Write a protein that binds this DNA or RNA. Structure first.
Ligand SMILES: [Mg+2]
Ligand SMILES: [Mg+2]
Ligand SMILES: [Mg+2]
Length: 34
RNA sequence: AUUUUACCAAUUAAGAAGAAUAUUAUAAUAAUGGGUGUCUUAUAUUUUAAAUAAAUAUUUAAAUUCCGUGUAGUAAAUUUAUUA
């Protein structure tokens, strides 16, 4: 698969990536706030 | 004695519940997939993985670089919160 630049989003097309966390405690933007 | 030639002109008041828990945004308190005329059991009713996503970010510098596609907490549970 390699999911090369595929816009897989639930609200966009109803499909989510196979390898990802179903829950995230802090969004990536919150982690960047060093 | 019967006896009126041919052609030439115009859309205007609308009578009636035959108009509404009506359309579209707006509610930051709920949420296990809604299916009524339904209704026995489930060896037959199981979807999960550290990445940009139904979670969406207050600047104009420098700087990698052969059109620089770029800005960092404002508060540490603090009052921008996905509401019916
Ligand atoms: Mg005339
Ligand atoms: Mg009428
Ligand atoms: Mg709630």
């Amino acid at each position: 698969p390699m999911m090369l630049n595929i816009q897989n989003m639930m609200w966009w097309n109803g499909k989510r990536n196979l390898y990802r966390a179903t829950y995230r405690e802090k969004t990536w933007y919150e982690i960047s706030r060093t």
